[PDB]
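dumping the sequnces here before i forget
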Amino acid sequence: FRTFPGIPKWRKTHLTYRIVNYTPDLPKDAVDSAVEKALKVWEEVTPLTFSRLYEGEADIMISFAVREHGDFYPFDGPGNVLAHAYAPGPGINGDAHFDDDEQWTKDTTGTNLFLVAAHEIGHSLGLFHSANTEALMYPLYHSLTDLTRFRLSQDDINGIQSLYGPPPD
Ligand SMILES: [Ca+2]
Ligand SMILES: [Ca+2]
Ligand SMILES: [Ca+2]
Ligand SMILES: [Zn+2]
Ligand SMILES: [Zn+2]
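..and the predicted 3d for all of it:
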């Protein structure tokens, strides 16, 4: 696993998220479930906990965007860059933007929202890319049809626990 230069990390264990907008690709509850499960992945192996906000500035603001969207990194149309997320910190840091030029799906027929979201939240929490091929934090989106088997790899658990430690009890 790779942590980020300077090892920026959250100095608190309780983090808020806000789903700022919704893609036309899916039912709103599918977007909610995907994001909720993505957080869970990481919540499960650390003392981090998450709560959702519906107004104000949450630590992790989540949105869908197309091309230019308010930061210096425009999205790029279909495929390639699927999303991006900023390392821990204030304001735009911690935030995650998903390219709506992708077709987000609950399954693997398009771009799986839960999988990319689990990866991006890894970034929002302090993990950079891993050199390990079976890690979620590996840069490589394969269209893993088999989400039925998903498990955070040990390398991901090692990286995230190196930042925040294991679960307390
Ligand atoms: Ca933020
Ligand atoms: Ca793209
Ligand atoms: Ca879309
Ligand atoms: Zn962005
Ligand atoms: Zn990444």
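The helical segments are 28-43, 113-125, 154-164.
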